[PDB]
Amino acid sequence: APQETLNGGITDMLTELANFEKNVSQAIHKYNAYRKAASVIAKYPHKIKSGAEAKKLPGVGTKIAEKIDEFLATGKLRKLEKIRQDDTSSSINFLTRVSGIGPSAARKFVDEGIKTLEDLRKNEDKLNHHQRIGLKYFGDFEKRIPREEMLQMQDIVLNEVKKVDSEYIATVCGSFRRGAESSGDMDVLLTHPSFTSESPKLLHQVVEQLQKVHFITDTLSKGETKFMGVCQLPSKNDEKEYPHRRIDIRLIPKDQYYCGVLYFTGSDIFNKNMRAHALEKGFTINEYTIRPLGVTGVAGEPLPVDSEKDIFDYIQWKYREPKDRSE
DNA sequence: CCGACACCGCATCAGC
DNA sequence: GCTGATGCGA
DNA sequence: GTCGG
Ligand code: NA
Ligand code: NA
Ligand code: NA
Ligand code: NA
């Protein structure tokens, strides 16, 4: 990835715009347009010299080109400078960094004078359970997880899962499975041969055991199929304790497990390609299944999948390691 | 010109 | 009390 | 905001 000294002023600007669209204007599609513009620029291996040059990249249109022209000539953007000094908008944007506070909650809070973390601390009674946990770990949740801590975390998850029942299958996916040197959270996919698409406490038993050994510390949400919560590695005596971390655990039917693992391994870019390719060979892939497409476009019934490689074999692609699924 | 821009599990609200 | 909608995060 | 039917 080209040094961000290249176009970092431009991509930072676009990302800041993206956030205000999402969190203040509640314009999720403009949020994503700015994100896509910023991504394509961040990978452009030349220092951009004009809006017209940037406009050639897919996802950069007339308006962002105009904004790049103004940034290059003046070193700033009038609209962005203004919105940053706006006390109401900057506060709404900021509050959304608390897990559980979205654009709607943030606007309600700022409306009633609640603008800072200290204001949230004073008003516990107006926070729901999720938002209280997000406040508690506000700083911890914004730190990344070094891969060595993810390995220590994996060790615990895989040990305790097998202890509940040695027939469970658990896989830590996300960028960690692709080999990333750091993670933002831990995404665990779980299955059991007794659970198929046409097969009730399989998830709870695992959560309970991880809570019993004091790895899981808090629960954001928990149902029959998805757990979302908080975990923390055990601290060695005297040594500073580790930050609390976000962990999700999903229970997936066995016949859909490897479609799940393939999907939640990613990357997002590799996933678009593989589904693009799959289409071009007569198959439709989603996170659950791969199905054949007839000539008139009618999807037939899901194909049996017993490994990730089964999916690749169907679409006439050679198996690619997680480490090579960057695109 | 103008619709798409992913889908869904869970917590919680809004309406009956 | 139930049912569907909405907010949130993925 | 951008793309494309
Ligand atoms: Na463009
Ligand atoms: Na938030
Ligand atoms: Na956020
Ligand atoms: Na056993």
mmCIF file of C-alpha atoms (C1' of nucleotides) and ligand atoms in Angstrom:
data_model
loop_
_atom_site.group_PDB
_atom_site.id
_atom_site.type_symbol
_atom_site.label_atom_id
_atom_site.label_comp_id
_atom_site.label_asym_id
_atom_site.label_seq_id
_atom_site.Cartn_x
_atom_site.Cartn_y
_atom_site.Cartn_z
ATOM 1 C CA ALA A 1 0.000 0.000 0.000
ATOM 2 C CA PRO A 2 1.516 3.316 -1.110
ATOM 3 C CA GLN A 3 2.702 5.496 1.792
ATOM 4 C CA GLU A 4 -0.213 7.558 3.014
ATOM 5 C CA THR A 5 2.020 10.615 2.695
ATOM 6 C CA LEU A 6 1.023 10.204 -0.994
ATOM 7 C CA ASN A 7 -2.657 11.182 -0.824
ATOM 8 C CA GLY A 8 -3.358 11.013 2.912
ATOM 9 C CA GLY A 9 -4.709 14.541 3.061
ATOM 10 C CA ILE A 10 -7.208 13.545 0.378
ATOM 11 C CA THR A 11 -8.196 10.209 1.838
ATOM 12 C CA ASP A 12 -8.401 11.612 5.383
ATOM 13 C CA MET A 13 -10.691 14.364 4.071
ATOM 14 C CA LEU A 14 -12.917 11.883 2.284
ATOM 15 C CA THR A 15 -13.097 9.640 5.348
ATOM 16 C CA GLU A 16 -14.101 12.583 7.557
ATOM 17 C CA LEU A 17 -16.814 13.506 5.069
ATOM 18 C CA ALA A 18 -17.874 9.861 5.057
ATOM 19 C CA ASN A 19 -18.354 9.904 8.832
ATOM 20 C CA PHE A 20 -20.491 13.050 8.886
ATOM 21 C CA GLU A 21 -22.710 11.613 6.144
ATOM 22 C CA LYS A 22 -23.209 8.431 8.164
ATOM 23 C CA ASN A 23 -23.457 9.862 11.677
ATOM 24 C CA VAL A 24 -24.922 13.346 11.166
ATOM 25 C CA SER A 25 -26.763 13.404 7.841
ATOM 26 C CA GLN A 26 -27.860 9.749 8.129
ATOM 27 C CA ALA A 27 -26.986 9.292 4.427
ATOM 28 C CA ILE A 28 -25.549 5.774 4.470
ATOM 29 C CA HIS A 29 -25.117 5.631 0.681
ATOM 30 C CA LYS A 30 -23.079 8.843 0.676
ATOM 31 C CA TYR A 31 -21.031 7.454 3.562
ATOM 32 C CA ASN A 32 -20.252 4.466 1.370
ATOM 33 C CA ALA A 33 -19.531 6.575 -1.717
ATOM 34 C CA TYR A 34 -16.913 8.557 0.193
ATOM 35 C CA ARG A 35 -15.495 5.309 1.627
ATOM 36 C CA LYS A 36 -15.166 3.833 -1.858
ATOM 37 C CA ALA A 37 -13.595 7.003 -3.235
ATOM 38 C CA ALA A 38 -11.129 7.058 -0.348
ATOM 39 C CA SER A 39 -10.281 3.378 -0.824
ATOM 40 C CA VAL A 40 -9.557 3.625 -4.538
ATOM 41 C CA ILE A 41 -7.404 6.704 -3.926
ATOM 42 C CA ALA A 42 -5.559 5.078 -1.009
ATOM 43 C CA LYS A 43 -4.332 2.331 -3.373
ATOM 44 C CA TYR A 44 -3.481 4.736 -6.243
ATOM 45 C CA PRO A 45 0.339 4.625 -6.452
ATOM 46 C CA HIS A 46 0.876 8.250 -7.541
ATOM 47 C CA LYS A 47 0.540 11.599 -5.792
ATOM 48 C CA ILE A 48 -2.699 13.025 -7.214
ATOM 49 C CA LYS A 49 -2.293 16.421 -8.856
ATOM 50 C CA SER A 50 -5.846 17.365 -9.846
ATOM 51 C CA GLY A 51 -9.473 16.449 -9.465
ATOM 52 C CA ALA A 52 -9.542 15.413 -13.122
ATOM 53 C CA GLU A 53 -6.782 12.867 -12.474
ATOM 54 C CA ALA A 54 -8.678 11.379 -9.531
ATOM 55 C CA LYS A 55 -11.947 11.386 -11.489
ATOM 56 C CA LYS A 56 -10.563 8.634 -13.734
ATOM 57 C CA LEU A 57 -10.638 6.183 -10.800
ATOM 58 C CA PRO A 58 -13.868 4.166 -10.417
ATOM 59 C CA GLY A 59 -15.889 5.687 -7.585
ATOM 60 C CA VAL A 60 -14.578 9.264 -7.925
ATOM 61 C CA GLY A 61 -17.194 11.527 -9.475
ATOM 62 C CA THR A 62 -17.687 15.188 -10.314
ATOM 63 C CA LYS A 63 -18.222 16.325 -6.730
ATOM 64 C CA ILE A 64 -15.239 14.626 -5.102
ATOM 65 C CA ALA A 65 -13.043 15.876 -7.962
ATOM 66 C CA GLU A 66 -14.225 19.418 -7.197
ATOM 67 C CA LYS A 67 -13.405 18.815 -3.531
ATOM 68 C CA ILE A 68 -9.938 17.500 -4.409
ATOM 69 C CA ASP A 69 -9.269 20.593 -6.532
ATOM 70 C CA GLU A 70 -10.125 22.800 -3.554
ATOM 71 C CA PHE A 71 -8.049 20.702 -1.143
ATOM 72 C CA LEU A 72 -5.019 20.818 -3.449
ATOM 73 C CA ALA A 73 -5.251 24.569 -3.993
ATOM 74 C CA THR A 74 -6.056 25.581 -0.418
ATOM 75 C CA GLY A 75 -4.998 22.690 1.795
ATOM 76 C CA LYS A 76 -8.499 22.412 3.277
ATOM 77 C CA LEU A 77 -12.205 22.193 2.482
ATOM 78 C CA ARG A 78 -14.534 25.010 3.569
ATOM 79 C CA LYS A 79 -17.504 22.702 4.177
ATOM 80 C CA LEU A 80 -15.399 20.343 6.267
ATOM 81 C CA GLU A 81 -13.728 23.114 8.291
ATOM 82 C CA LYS A 82 -17.191 24.498 9.090
ATOM 83 C CA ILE A 83 -18.682 21.187 10.142
ATOM 84 C CA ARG A 84 -15.756 20.426 12.503
ATOM 85 C CA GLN A 85 -16.300 23.689 14.375
ATOM 86 C CA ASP A 86 -20.025 22.964 14.637
ATOM 87 C CA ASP A 87 -20.637 21.958 18.232
ATOM 88 C CA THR A 88 -23.790 19.959 17.559
ATOM 89 C CA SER A 89 -22.497 18.042 14.532
ATOM 90 C CA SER A 90 -19.067 17.224 15.923
ATOM 91 C CA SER A 91 -20.715 15.974 19.133
ATOM 92 C CA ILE A 92 -23.174 13.742 17.278
ATOM 93 C CA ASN A 93 -20.339 12.364 15.146
ATOM 94 C CA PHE A 94 -18.211 11.727 18.229
ATOM 95 C CA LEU A 95 -20.839 9.947 20.294
ATOM 96 C CA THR A 96 -21.310 7.312 17.602
ATOM 97 C CA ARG A 97 -17.868 5.951 18.504
ATOM 98 C CA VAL A 98 -19.570 4.338 21.500
ATOM 99 C CA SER A 99 -20.663 0.834 20.549
ATOM 100 C CA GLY A 100 -24.468 0.817 20.778
ATOM 101 C CA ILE A 101 -24.861 4.531 20.007
ATOM 102 C CA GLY A 102 -25.789 4.911 16.357
ATOM 103 C CA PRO A 103 -26.741 8.087 14.487
ATOM 104 C CA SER A 104 -30.253 8.068 15.976
ATOM 105 C CA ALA A 105 -29.139 7.662 19.606
ATOM 106 C CA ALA A 106 -26.336 10.203 19.147
ATOM 107 C CA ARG A 107 -28.750 12.806 17.761
ATOM 108 C CA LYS A 108 -31.211 12.236 20.609
ATOM 109 C CA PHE A 109 -28.465 12.603 23.212
ATOM 110 C CA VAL A 110 -27.015 15.803 21.719
ATOM 111 C CA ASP A 111 -30.559 17.196 21.417
ATOM 112 C CA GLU A 112 -30.952 16.897 25.198
ATOM 113 C CA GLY A 113 -27.515 18.354 26.004
ATOM 114 C CA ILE A 114 -25.620 15.045 26.322
ATOM 115 C CA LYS A 115 -22.456 15.592 24.238
ATOM 116 C CA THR A 116 -19.379 14.039 25.888
ATOM 117 C CA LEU A 117 -18.328 10.774 27.489
ATOM 118 C CA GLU A 118 -18.548 12.547 30.839
ATOM 119 C CA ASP A 119 -22.147 13.471 29.981
ATOM 120 C CA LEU A 120 -22.850 9.801 29.246
ATOM 121 C CA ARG A 121 -21.229 8.752 32.544
ATOM 122 C CA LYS A 122 -23.601 11.121 34.354
ATOM 123 C CA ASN A 123 -26.693 9.679 32.632
ATOM 124 C CA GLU A 124 -26.495 5.890 33.004
ATOM 125 C CA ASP A 125 -30.280 5.730 33.316
ATOM 126 C CA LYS A 126 -30.676 6.855 29.687
ATOM 127 C CA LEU A 127 -28.302 4.212 28.260
ATOM 128 C CA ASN A 128 -29.349 0.708 27.317
ATOM 129 C CA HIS A 129 -27.308 -2.362 28.329
ATOM 130 C CA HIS A 130 -25.267 -2.335 25.102
ATOM 131 C CA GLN A 131 -24.459 1.356 25.316
ATOM 132 C CA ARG A 132 -23.378 0.991 28.949
ATOM 133 C CA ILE A 133 -20.892 -1.707 27.947
ATOM 134 C CA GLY A 134 -19.717 0.426 25.025
ATOM 135 C CA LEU A 135 -19.112 3.347 27.369
ATOM 136 C CA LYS A 136 -17.281 1.157 29.892
ATOM 137 C CA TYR A 137 -14.845 -0.150 27.295
ATOM 138 C CA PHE A 138 -14.789 2.921 25.038
ATOM 139 C CA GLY A 139 -11.003 3.092 24.962
ATOM 140 C CA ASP A 140 -10.390 -0.652 24.942
ATOM 141 C CA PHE A 141 -12.712 -1.188 21.991
ATOM 142 C CA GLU A 142 -10.761 1.307 19.871
ATOM 143 C CA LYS A 143 -7.430 -0.509 20.341
ATOM 144 C CA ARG A 144 -6.408 -3.192 17.883
ATOM 145 C CA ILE A 145 -5.545 -6.772 18.873
ATOM 146 C CA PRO A 146 -1.978 -7.946 18.119
ATOM 147 C CA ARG A 147 -1.842 -11.334 16.430
ATOM 148 C CA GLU A 148 -0.030 -12.929 19.383
ATOM 149 C CA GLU A 149 -2.945 -11.980 21.636
ATOM 150 C CA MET A 150 -5.348 -13.373 19.036
ATOM 151 C CA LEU A 151 -3.417 -16.649 19.163
ATOM 152 C CA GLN A 152 -3.672 -16.704 22.980
ATOM 153 C CA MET A 153 -7.385 -15.944 22.608
ATOM 154 C CA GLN A 154 -7.813 -18.690 20.002
ATOM 155 C CA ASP A 155 -6.058 -21.140 22.355
ATOM 156 C CA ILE A 156 -8.693 -20.464 25.040
ATOM 157 C CA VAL A 157 -11.678 -20.601 22.664
ATOM 158 C CA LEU A 158 -10.618 -23.847 21.003
ATOM 159 C CA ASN A 159 -9.702 -25.505 24.328
ATOM 160 C CA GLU A 160 -12.978 -24.632 26.060
ATOM 161 C CA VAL A 161 -15.133 -25.486 23.027
ATOM 162 C CA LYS A 162 -13.615 -28.992 22.796
ATOM 163 C CA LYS A 163 -14.049 -29.343 26.574
ATOM 164 C CA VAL A 164 -17.820 -28.791 26.278
ATOM 165 C CA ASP A 165 -18.026 -31.348 23.463
ATOM 166 C CA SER A 166 -15.121 -32.698 21.394
ATOM 167 C CA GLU A 167 -17.421 -32.891 18.356
ATOM 168 C CA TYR A 168 -17.891 -29.113 18.081
ATOM 169 C CA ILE A 169 -16.005 -27.425 15.250
ATOM 170 C CA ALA A 170 -14.839 -23.855 15.899
ATOM 171 C CA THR A 171 -12.971 -21.615 13.443
ATOM 172 C CA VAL A 172 -11.643 -18.114 14.136
ATOM 173 C CA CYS A 173 -12.189 -16.234 10.893
ATOM 174 C CA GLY A 174 -11.855 -12.600 9.843
ATOM 175 C CA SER A 175 -8.548 -11.100 8.771
ATOM 176 C CA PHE A 176 -6.807 -13.155 11.465
ATOM 177 C CA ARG A 177 -7.480 -16.343 9.516
ATOM 178 C CA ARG A 178 -6.009 -14.711 6.414
ATOM 179 C CA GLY A 179 -2.845 -14.100 8.476
ATOM 180 C CA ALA A 180 -3.249 -10.458 9.520
ATOM 181 C CA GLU A 181 -0.744 -9.153 12.063
ATOM 182 C CA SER A 182 -3.558 -7.409 13.952
ATOM 183 C CA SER A 183 -7.309 -7.695 14.365
ATOM 184 C CA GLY A 184 -10.133 -5.414 15.421
ATOM 185 C CA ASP A 185 -12.112 -8.196 17.110
ATOM 186 C CA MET A 186 -12.502 -11.974 17.257
ATOM 187 C CA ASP A 187 -15.097 -13.670 15.035
ATOM 188 C CA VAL A 188 -15.744 -17.305 15.980
ATOM 189 C CA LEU A 189 -17.816 -19.635 13.802
ATOM 190 C CA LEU A 190 -19.156 -22.717 15.548
ATOM 191 C CA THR A 191 -20.881 -25.904 14.413
ATOM 192 C CA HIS A 192 -21.803 -29.405 15.592
ATOM 193 C CA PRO A 193 -22.837 -32.480 13.562
ATOM 194 C CA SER A 194 -26.147 -32.624 15.438
ATOM 195 C CA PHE A 195 -27.192 -29.253 13.904
ATOM 196 C CA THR A 196 -28.160 -29.065 10.211
ATOM 197 C CA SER A 197 -30.520 -26.898 8.144
ATOM 198 C CA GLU A 198 -33.504 -29.182 8.895
ATOM 199 C CA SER A 199 -32.372 -30.549 12.251
ATOM 200 C CA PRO A 200 -31.231 -25.252 20.519
ATOM 201 C CA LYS A 201 -28.692 -24.916 23.358
ATOM 202 C CA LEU A 202 -25.471 -25.663 21.425
ATOM 203 C CA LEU A 203 -24.478 -21.985 21.510
ATOM 204 C CA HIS A 204 -25.362 -21.387 25.154
ATOM 205 C CA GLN A 205 -23.194 -24.245 26.438
ATOM 206 C CA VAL A 206 -20.109 -22.730 24.802
ATOM 207 C CA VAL A 207 -20.816 -19.173 25.998
ATOM 208 C CA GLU A 208 -21.435 -20.503 29.500
ATOM 209 C CA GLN A 209 -18.094 -22.337 29.586
ATOM 210 C CA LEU A 210 -16.188 -19.293 28.336
ATOM 211 C CA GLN A 211 -17.879 -17.293 31.075
ATOM 212 C CA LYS A 212 -17.085 -19.962 33.640
ATOM 213 C CA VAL A 213 -13.318 -19.683 32.994
ATOM 214 C CA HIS A 214 -13.763 -15.871 33.011
ATOM 215 C CA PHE A 215 -12.749 -15.318 29.382
ATOM 216 C CA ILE A 216 -16.133 -13.838 28.368
ATOM 217 C CA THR A 217 -16.764 -10.865 30.685
ATOM 218 C CA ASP A 218 -19.896 -9.156 29.287
ATOM 219 C CA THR A 219 -22.740 -9.964 26.909
ATOM 220 C CA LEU A 220 -23.964 -7.478 24.311
ATOM 221 C CA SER A 221 -26.521 -9.829 22.783
ATOM 222 C CA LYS A 222 -27.199 -13.551 22.862
ATOM 223 C CA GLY A 223 -29.679 -15.715 21.039
ATOM 224 C CA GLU A 224 -29.890 -19.259 19.676
ATOM 225 C CA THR A 225 -27.614 -18.473 16.727
ATOM 226 C CA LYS A 226 -25.421 -15.412 17.463
ATOM 227 C CA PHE A 227 -23.523 -14.224 20.554
ATOM 228 C CA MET A 228 -21.899 -10.796 20.707
ATOM 229 C CA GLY A 229 -19.903 -9.785 23.751
ATOM 230 C CA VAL A 230 -16.675 -8.889 25.486
ATOM 231 C CA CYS A 231 -13.684 -10.962 26.480
ATOM 232 C CA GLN A 232 -10.300 -10.497 28.166
ATOM 233 C CA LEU A 233 -7.137 -12.584 28.366
ATOM 234 C CA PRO A 234 -6.049 -13.503 31.902
ATOM 235 C CA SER A 235 -3.423 -11.154 33.273
ATOM 236 C CA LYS A 236 -0.211 -12.562 34.660
ATOM 237 C CA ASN A 237 0.363 -11.404 38.240
ATOM 238 C CA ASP A 238 1.858 -7.891 38.609
ATOM 239 C CA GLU A 239 1.647 -7.277 34.858
ATOM 240 C CA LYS A 240 -0.753 -4.708 33.429
ATOM 241 C CA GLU A 241 -4.055 -6.342 32.523
ATOM 242 C CA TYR A 242 -5.017 -6.822 28.892
ATOM 243 C CA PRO A 243 -7.741 -4.630 27.323
ATOM 244 C CA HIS A 244 -11.244 -5.978 26.933
ATOM 245 C CA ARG A 245 -11.929 -7.216 23.411
ATOM 246 C CA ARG A 246 -14.969 -7.711 21.209
ATOM 247 C CA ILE A 247 -15.871 -11.309 20.446
ATOM 248 C CA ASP A 248 -18.735 -12.619 18.316
ATOM 249 C CA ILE A 249 -19.667 -16.306 18.182
ATOM 250 C CA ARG A 250 -22.064 -17.682 15.552
ATOM 251 C CA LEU A 251 -23.598 -21.151 15.510
ATOM 252 C CA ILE A 252 -24.096 -22.281 11.905
ATOM 253 C CA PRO A 253 -25.723 -25.466 10.570
ATOM 254 C CA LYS A 254 -23.129 -28.051 9.572
ATOM 255 C CA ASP A 255 -24.286 -28.156 5.947
ATOM 256 C CA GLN A 256 -23.721 -24.370 5.735
ATOM 257 C CA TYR A 257 -20.576 -24.126 7.862
ATOM 258 C CA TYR A 258 -17.942 -23.938 5.157
ATOM 259 C CA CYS A 259 -19.911 -21.414 3.094
ATOM 260 C CA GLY A 260 -19.976 -19.444 6.358
ATOM 261 C CA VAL A 261 -16.227 -19.797 6.960
ATOM 262 C CA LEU A 262 -15.409 -18.857 3.359
ATOM 263 C CA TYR A 263 -17.618 -15.772 3.667
ATOM 264 C CA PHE A 264 -16.563 -14.534 7.097
ATOM 265 C CA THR A 265 -12.923 -15.123 6.165
ATOM 266 C CA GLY A 266 -13.122 -12.658 3.274
ATOM 267 C CA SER A 267 -11.644 -10.346 2.317
ATOM 268 C CA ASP A 268 -14.636 -8.380 1.086
ATOM 269 C CA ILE A 269 -12.795 -7.876 -2.214
ATOM 270 C CA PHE A 270 -11.966 -11.563 -2.626
ATOM 271 C CA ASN A 271 -15.615 -12.341 -1.866
ATOM 272 C CA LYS A 272 -16.978 -10.104 -4.651
ATOM 273 C CA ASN A 273 -14.602 -11.712 -7.172
ATOM 274 C CA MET A 274 -15.430 -15.279 -6.162
ATOM 275 C CA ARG A 275 -19.170 -14.613 -6.441
ATOM 276 C CA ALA A 276 -18.621 -12.771 -9.715
ATOM 277 C CA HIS A 277 -16.632 -15.755 -10.992
ATOM 278 C CA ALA A 278 -19.150 -18.237 -9.587
ATOM 279 C CA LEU A 279 -21.968 -16.486 -11.430
ATOM 280 C CA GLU A 280 -19.962 -16.652 -14.687
ATOM 281 C CA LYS A 281 -19.763 -20.460 -14.249
ATOM 282 C CA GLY A 282 -23.443 -20.981 -13.415
ATOM 283 C CA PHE A 283 -23.422 -20.910 -9.602
ATOM 284 C CA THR A 284 -24.725 -18.455 -7.015
ATOM 285 C CA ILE A 285 -22.760 -18.247 -3.745
ATOM 286 C CA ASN A 286 -23.994 -16.599 -0.573
ATOM 287 C CA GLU A 287 -22.846 -16.902 3.035
ATOM 288 C CA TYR A 288 -25.113 -19.951 3.444
ATOM 289 C CA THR A 289 -25.051 -22.045 0.252
ATOM 290 C CA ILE A 290 -23.855 -22.422 -3.331
ATOM 291 C CA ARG A 291 -26.631 -23.170 -5.812
ATOM 292 C CA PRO A 292 -26.669 -23.862 -9.558
ATOM 293 C CA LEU A 293 -28.427 -21.456 -11.890
ATOM 294 C CA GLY A 294 -30.468 -22.861 -14.773
ATOM 295 C CA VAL A 295 -30.593 -21.311 -18.246
ATOM 296 C CA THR A 296 -33.649 -19.148 -17.477
ATOM 297 C CA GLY A 297 -31.945 -18.042 -14.223
ATOM 298 C CA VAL A 298 -33.854 -20.263 -11.759
ATOM 299 C CA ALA A 299 -31.632 -21.220 -8.830
ATOM 300 C CA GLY A 300 -31.848 -24.903 -7.960
ATOM 301 C CA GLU A 301 -31.283 -26.545 -4.598
ATOM 302 C CA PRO A 302 -28.059 -26.054 -2.578
ATOM 303 C CA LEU A 303 -25.080 -28.281 -3.454
ATOM 304 C CA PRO A 304 -23.416 -30.389 -0.727
ATOM 305 C CA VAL A 305 -20.418 -28.606 0.813
ATOM 306 C CA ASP A 306 -18.089 -30.491 3.171
ATOM 307 C CA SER A 307 -15.049 -28.198 3.026
ATOM 308 C CA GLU A 308 -14.058 -24.813 1.699
ATOM 309 C CA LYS A 309 -12.354 -26.576 -1.218
ATOM 310 C CA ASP A 310 -15.714 -28.112 -2.183
ATOM 311 C CA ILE A 311 -16.852 -24.571 -3.020
ATOM 312 C CA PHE A 312 -13.765 -23.887 -5.162
ATOM 313 C CA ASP A 313 -14.168 -27.214 -6.988
ATOM 314 C CA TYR A 314 -17.723 -26.284 -8.001
ATOM 315 C CA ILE A 315 -16.681 -23.022 -9.639
ATOM 316 C CA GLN A 316 -13.651 -24.563 -11.358
ATOM 317 C CA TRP A 317 -11.303 -22.374 -9.251
ATOM 318 C CA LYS A 318 -8.212 -23.813 -7.606
ATOM 319 C CA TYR A 319 -8.215 -23.661 -3.810
ATOM 320 C CA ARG A 320 -6.637 -20.484 -2.480
ATOM 321 C CA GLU A 321 -5.183 -20.379 1.039
ATOM 322 C CA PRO A 322 -6.686 -17.765 3.374
ATOM 323 C CA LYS A 323 -3.367 -15.846 3.161
ATOM 324 C CA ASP A 324 -3.881 -15.372 -0.603
ATOM 325 C CA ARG A 325 -7.509 -14.170 -0.340
ATOM 326 C CA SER A 326 -6.524 -10.499 -0.131
ATOM 327 C CA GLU A 327 -8.331 -10.134 -3.472
ATOM 328 C "C1'" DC B 1 -33.562 10.535 -15.348
ATOM 329 C "C1'" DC B 2 -33.635 7.911 -11.473
ATOM 330 C "C1'" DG B 3 -33.106 3.432 -8.606
ATOM 331 C "C1'" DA B 4 -29.423 0.688 -6.428
ATOM 332 C "C1'" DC B 5 -26.061 0.959 -3.203
ATOM 333 C "C1'" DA B 6 -26.524 -6.819 1.114
ATOM 334 C "C1'" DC B 7 -28.474 -9.378 4.216
ATOM 335 C "C1'" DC B 8 -29.809 -10.518 8.836
ATOM 336 C "C1'" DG B 9 -29.794 -11.703 14.415
ATOM 337 C "C1'" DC B 10 -30.941 -9.546 18.489
ATOM 338 C "C1'" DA B 11 -32.636 -5.778 21.623
ATOM 339 C "C1'" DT B 12 -35.941 -2.566 21.840
ATOM 340 C "C1'" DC B 13 -39.526 0.328 20.443
ATOM 341 C "C1'" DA B 14 -44.218 1.462 18.349
ATOM 342 C "C1'" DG B 15 -48.635 0.087 17.450
ATOM 343 C "C1'" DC B 16 -52.396 -2.553 18.311
ATOM 344 C "C1'" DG C 1 -49.754 -9.472 25.883
ATOM 345 C "C1'" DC C 2 -48.518 -10.062 20.596
ATOM 346 C "C1'" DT C 3 -46.612 -8.575 16.006
ATOM 347 C "C1'" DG C 4 -44.015 -5.948 13.088
ATOM 348 C "C1'" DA C 5 -40.765 -1.931 12.719
ATOM 349 C "C1'" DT C 6 -36.570 0.178 13.718
ATOM 350 C "C1'" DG C 7 -31.699 0.790 15.410
ATOM 351 C "C1'" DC C 8 -27.511 -1.227 15.652
ATOM 352 C "C1'" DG C 9 -23.656 -3.821 14.332
ATOM 353 C "C1'" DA C 10 -21.691 -5.602 11.739
ATOM 354 C "C1'" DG D 1 -22.180 10.796 -4.300
ATOM 355 C "C1'" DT D 2 -21.457 7.610 -7.992
ATOM 356 C "C1'" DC D 3 -22.703 4.504 -11.278
ATOM 357 C "C1'" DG D 4 -25.294 2.576 -14.967
ATOM 358 C "C1'" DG D 5 -29.740 0.714 -17.263
HETATM 359 NA NA NA E 1 -14.545 8.153 -11.639
HETATM 360 NA NA NA E 2 -21.661 3.492 17.811
HETATM 361 NA NA NA E 3 -19.210 3.740 15.584
HETATM 362 NA NA NA E 4 -16.288 -36.291 23.371
#
